[PDB]
């Protein structure tokens, strides 16, 4: 039971491979790729709004009046320094979800319910505001007159329109932004038809017509084909592994099925008869005739156009006592580029030629080859053959390569255009008529005669494989056109089949009915590729954005990894569990090294510049506390009383608890707190407003540090904030008994933002109900000759054996 | 008790770290070392330390 | 006397190998067809009826 | 096949009798010799026509 022994090996080298079980299932996932959907908001970005709070004036008193104070909405900043930045980050991730394409300021405007000429607004959080400030009476009367006399400007003729707005610097930062950056670009019939591949409109098989107009206000966006900036293809062998197999089962799904092939029957009666095996005493009697069927020909076909198309690394499976197989072959490595195949497969079929065609024809000693040996066995054969008219073919067939050529922005994998018209294989038909002519010295003749005419029948079937050549390739240039990330030769580490019994049934089984690809299926397999393409790209720019954003917000505790996956997740062909690590290390690091995509950043820099302006309001944490064992006097402030607030931070030495947590350290702060040192705690940390004045005679205050040195764990560190007024229930202490409210222990926080009317008041312009068309090959009205009459590159018809 | 979250390379080994971070005893250097010792990769390599 | 700094150490080790245990799995075989079949000295055996 | 970089195998210990066995312990060395043919014997072809 050593065959099953395969199974487990191939079985370990598959739990290394991010393919998914059955490769059909591939096909369902890339269509599944759609391209990026078009957002839009209904409703502006908004971090603040107006609150109208209390006042006290100095002697705690409230005053008559409140005051328009910026506020946060939902306020949910939480404890400690490394979540804040989180929550930052996740803040810039989720606008970044939200980020709109295009916006249109007449899809959410509405009426000013204040103004004499039929005044509107943009948006309903903007007239909410617009009211309550036309009837306070603290406000002055030109705001009033302003509000009453505001004016949008429609205009159509040139689609703009201008929309006040009222809304805080920041959130008219990323609104401006949104307006300014948008990604929609104008739309015509010339894109459409450049947007099409050159070689398919400057060939005349594949008639193109346009036959729907579009008017100025169409809208597309330039997806981003920006070729592989990772490099998958060197020292990521699974991953590439992977995409190429994607490719080839895409590939399959788009080649041209062949049709009006030969009775199978046929041709079985005339090789069974031409053959004459019954005459022999060999033990290859049923199995030679196996595999000539169609379904195995139409195989071989997809198979050979998908691998070239994809750079699948295949192989040669065969039976060696076949030589209708390797005669086969020969035209195989003809035709196909040596580089395609598995080296060690590819010397077994040119040794089995060699060693059972060629050299016993000639009469040479038969070989003995090294394994390793640099020199390919047709190579060695080039040299040792006195012939030309099968030297020559080995030399071609040496030096039968793909050839790089840059087109339309994309590497391509090209022909040597002996290939494309089918020439060449004029000279391996001679180097055949040659094989059958001679004597084989040595060997029998019952043999000697059936090799010789299984070599007759390829070269009758001398026209209809010029025939079968031109067309392969000319369905493997046009497929290649529908192509938009460089195409680049990898040997894979698992490798698609192919049975030379499918070559013969292909060479042996064809003729005259020539198979092209419909414009729809060339849409298709573009549109697909396109899809795929961008979706990389997009993966790869918000993954480096993240990454780049983590390590400026200095978040540490997180893993890179959880990223790395998610971008592979995102991408359907990836199965992660599978994956080695090393790969997905070296993905981090060839991630890191790339710079970030331009929106990506911008916003970012928005969020940096402002992030402490955002983490300064939140009344629910504190930038820090401060001790100081000194009877300090409590200040005085408009939104609270008296106070224990300080807004510098200086003249005291900063530790910092992030640090301090993280470090347990702990001998720094209790030699400090035992030995009652000045000190400023620095840190996001909650607090409580304290509203009594026996609390703060009490001394409460510091009475919130020893459970630091008990429990070394600093995050139930909850300050007292006093503020004391006229409605603490106890400030009847402070205004009839002639002493200056004091403490110690000053809380690290900042005044509110006051409300300002001028700064606020901004103009936004946007367009007008333009529109946004997202597949536009649909725009293109495509046709084909009649097959029968069509021409490859040479400007002479295909398959011309009529 | 890792200020990234790292790794060590044993159960047993973690162990003894958490056995002596949470105690009362030990110095503060004892629990900056633990804090600061992680893993490190190199996949040029393939290497991890 | 335990020694928390000195006690500790850095291990090395590559990432991600694998290992196989069969080798000729790997490698398929097949003879020429035994009428032609040739010993050392490059000429038949089995050559006379 | 095209196997990685990334994969690695076990070399066996193919060094010959270091206890030559062929030499007074003739019975150790006749069970040897017999599992050899009774193997050797298995794997010789049978005759064709």
């Known amino acids: 039971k050593e065959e099953h022994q395969k199974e487990v090996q191939y079985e370990i080298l598959q739990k290394t491979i991010p393919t998914f079980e059955p490769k059909e299932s591939i096909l369902k996932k890339l269509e599944d790729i759609k391209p990026e959907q078009v957002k839009k908001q209904t409703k502006l970005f908004r971090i603040f709004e107006p609150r109208q709070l209390p006042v006290y004036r100095a002697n705690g008193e409230k005053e008559l009046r409140n005051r328009w104070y910026w506020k946060l909405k939902r306020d949910t900043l939480p404890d400690g320094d490394y979540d804040v930045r989180e929550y930052f980050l996740n803040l810039y991730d989720q606008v970044l979800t939200e ?41 002055e009367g030109v705001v009033r007159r302003f509000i009453a006399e505001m004016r949008q400007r429609v205009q159509a003729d040139r689609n703009v329109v201008n929309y006040p707005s009222i809304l805080h610097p920041i959130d008219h930062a990323f609104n401006e932004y949104f307006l300014q950056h948008q990604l929609v670009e104008p739309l015509n019939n010339d894109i459409i038809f450049n947007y099409i591949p050159e070689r398919i409109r400057n060939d005349v098989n594949y008639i193109l017509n346009m036959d729907r107009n579009l008017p ?36 399959r799904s788009v080649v041209p099925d062949l049709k009006e092939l030969v009775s199978t029957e046929a041709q079985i009666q005339k090789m069974s008869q031409d053959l004459q095996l019954e005459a022999l005493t060999i033990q290859s009697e049923t199995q030679f005739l196996t595999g000539i ?19 699948r690394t295949m192989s040669l499976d065969f039976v060696t006592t076949n030589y209708m197989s390797l005669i086969s072959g020969m035209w195989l490595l003809t035709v196909v580029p040596n580089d395609m195949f598995i080296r060690e497969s590819l010397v077994a079929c040119q040794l089995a030629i060699i060693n059972t065609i060629i050299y016993p024809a000639f009469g040479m000693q038969r070989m003995h080859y090294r394994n390793g040996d640099p020199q390919t066995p047709f190579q060695i054969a080039e040299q040792q053959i006195q012939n030309f008219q099968v030297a020559n073919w080995l030399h071609f067939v040496n030096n039968n390569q793909f050839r790089q050529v840059v087109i339309d922005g994309v590497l391509n994998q090209v022909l040597n255009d002996n290939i494309r018209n ?13 094989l059958s002519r001679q004597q084989f010295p040595t060997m029998p003749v019952d043999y000697k005669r059936s090799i010789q005419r299984g070599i007759l029948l390829l070269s009758n079937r001398l026209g209809q494989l010029v025939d079968l050549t031109r067309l392969l390739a000319y369905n493997y240039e046009t497929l290649m056109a529908c192509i938009t990330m460089n195409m680049q030769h990898v040997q894979t580490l698992t490798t698609e089949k192919l049975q030379l019994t499918s070559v013969t049934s292909l060479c042996m089984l064809i003729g005259n009915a020539t198979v092209i690809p419909s414009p729809q299926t060339l849409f298709h397999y573009y549109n697909v590729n396109v899809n795929f393409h961008s979706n990389y790209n997009e993966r790869i720019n918000d993954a480096v954005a993240i990454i780049t954003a983590a390590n400026r917000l200095n978040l540490y505790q997180k893993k890179m990894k959880s990223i790395v996956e998610d971008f592979l997740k995102r991408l359907q062909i990836f199965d992660i569990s599978r994956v080695p690590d090393d790969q997905m290390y070296r993905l981090r690091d ?25 983490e300064r309001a939140s009344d629910k944490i504190a930038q820090g506390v401060i001790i100081a064992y000194r009877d300090m006097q409590l200040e005085r402030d408009e939104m609270y009383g008296y106070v224990n607030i300080a807004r510098n931070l200086d003249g005291f030495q ?62 139930t560190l909850k300050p007292i904030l006093y503020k004391i007024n006229s409605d603490s229930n106890d400030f009847y202490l402070v205004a009839n008994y002639d002493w200056v409210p004091t403490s110690t222990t000053k809380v690290y926080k900042q005044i509110p933002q006051q409300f300002d009317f001028r700064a606020s008041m901004h103009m936004l312009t946007s367009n007008l109900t333009f529109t946004v068309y997202s597949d536009l090959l649909a725009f293109v009205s495509a046709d084909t000759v009649e097959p029968i009459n069509a021409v490859a590159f040479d400007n002479m018809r295909i398959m011309n054996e009529l």
């Open 216 to 251: 100025s206000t169409a809208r597309y966006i330039r997806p981003n084909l920006l070729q592989d900036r990772l490099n998958l293809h060197d020292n990521f062998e699974s991953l590439w592994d992977t995409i190429t197999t994607s490719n080839y089962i895409l590939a």
């Open 422 to 434: 089918g020439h060449v294989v004029n000279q391996l038909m001679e180097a055949l008529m040659q």
């Open 99 to 139: 980020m709109p394409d295009y916006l249109l300021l007449k899809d959410m405007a509405v009426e000013n319910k204040n103004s004499r000429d039929a005044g509107k607004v943009v948006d309903s959080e903007t007239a909410a505001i617009c009211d309550a400030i036309f009837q306070d009476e603290e406000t």
């Open 654 to 715: 900063q530790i910092n608890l992030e640090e301090l947590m993280r470090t347990g350290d702990y001998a720094q702060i209790t030699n400090m707190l035992l030995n009652n040192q000045p000190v400023a705690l620095v840190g996001a940390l909650p607090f409580i407003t304290d509203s009594s004045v026996i609390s703060l005679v009490a001394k409460l205050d510091a009475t919130v540090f020893a459970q630091i040195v008990k429990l070394r764990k600093v995050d």
């Open 590 to 614: 060839r991630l890191r090294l790339l710079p970030v995509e331009i929106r990506r950043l911008d916003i970012f820099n928005l969020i940096l510049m402002n992030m402490e302006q955002i």
């Open 293 to 311: 069927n169609s379904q195995a020909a139409n195989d071989c076909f997809k198979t050979l156009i998908a691998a070239m198309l994809s750079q």
